[PDB]
């Protein structure tokens, strides 16, 4: 249970995903661009966020399009996306536009916190 | 100087159930002072989940406290959760006369492990915050108020119980897939929360 900014550390996150095990997974990401011939959208970490390292990494998300808003490929445009990782690749189940007015230094932080402080 | 009430619970340890190298669970008389008991506070899903297993801190006493959790080792009395839909089921038992239709939903606010719980209400409730009868809610953001009930198991001490939150009242706070902002406002709301008054024990101790 995991909020990713960093879409390319996914596989560092869960080295133990699988088929077997897959991992439920929500990314905020930003749309760099989206390939329509095979239905992939290019998304990288949302810009101003962090410095650290990313990479972009292509989602299918061919099994969404009826239900997905046209919003969401276009490229420059802030989303959610929450699918499975099996470990190898991204089985997206729902995607959706979110606002920039988000993405505040007191949120990301909120975000880091929720991600390991919870259990007493 | 000001009044100082004082009552006496008896004498040495008699107050404290069980001592923890950590905190003190104390005994159900002391639970309405906790700063926590007959007031709804802002919890994470996690935190009631992940609440203990009260039979194998109070004994038979848990008998009585189906409708209490031990978040940490404060008693919560009335909880306050949000989440996400994740789940809608539709139920219309029959009486006599009386057609009574409820709501089961299943709500994540998705942080932490084990982030979902049971939610019950009737469908006039559900109906009056503009959440349609199609099945078609998954996504929106609601923030309940409600009582619990723990299935305890008094048998198997350790085991976590199956949970139902009978909800007093719903709040839809986005009918819209993106209600990101909304999120944020509620976690943290129940980050500052946890921060301030969870985190540290609660520790009781005589004027």
Not at chain 1, 6 to 32: D, G
Not at chain 2, 43 to 66: T, W
Not at chain 2, 88 to 111: A, C, T
Not at chain 2, 134 to 162: A, F, H, M, R
Request: glycine share 4%; proline share 6%; charged share 25%.
């Amino acid at each position: 249970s995991k909020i990713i900014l960093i879409p390319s550390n996914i596989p560092q996150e869960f080295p133990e995903a699988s088929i077997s095990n897959p991992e439920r997974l929500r990314i905020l990401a930003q749309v760099k661009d989206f390939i329509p011939h095979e239905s992939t959208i290019v998304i990288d970490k949302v810009p101003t966020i962090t410095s650290e390292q990313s990479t972009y990494i292509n989602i299918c998300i061919f099994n969404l399009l009826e239900a997905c808003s046209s919003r969401v490929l276009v490229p420059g445009t802030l989303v959610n996306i929450d699918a499975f990782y099996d470990g190898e690749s991204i089985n997206p189940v729902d995607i959706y536009e979110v606002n920039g007015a988000n993405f505040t230094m007191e949120n990301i932080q909120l975000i880091d916190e929720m991600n390991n402080s919870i259990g007493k | 100087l000001y009044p100082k009430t004082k009552i006496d619970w008896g004498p040495g340890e008699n107050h404290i159930c069980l001592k923890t190298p950590f905190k003190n669970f104390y005994v159900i008389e002391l639970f309405h002072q906790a700063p926590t008991f007959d007031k709804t506070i802002p919890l994470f899903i996690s935190d009631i989940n992940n609440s203990p297993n009260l039979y194998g801190i109070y004994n038979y006493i848990a008998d009585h406290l189906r409708h209490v959790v031990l978040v940490n080792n404060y008693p919560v009395n009335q909880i306050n959760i949000f989440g996400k839909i994740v789940y809608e089921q539709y139920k219309e038992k029959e009486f006599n006369g009386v057609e009574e239709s409820y709501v089961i939903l299943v709500i994540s606010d998705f942080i932490g492990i084990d982030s979902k719980i049971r939610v019950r209400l009737s469908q006039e409730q559900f109906k009056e915050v503009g959440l349609t009868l199609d099945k078609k809610n998954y996504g929106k953001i609601v923030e309940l108020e409600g009582e619990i009930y723990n299935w305890y198991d008094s048998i198997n001490v350790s085991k976590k119980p199956d949970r139902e939150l009978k909800v007093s009242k719903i709040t839809v706070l986005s009918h819209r897939p993106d209600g990101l902002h909304f999120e944020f406002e509620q976690w943290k709301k129940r980050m500052e929360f946890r921060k301030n008054n969870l985190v540290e024990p609660w520790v009781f101790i005589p004027t």
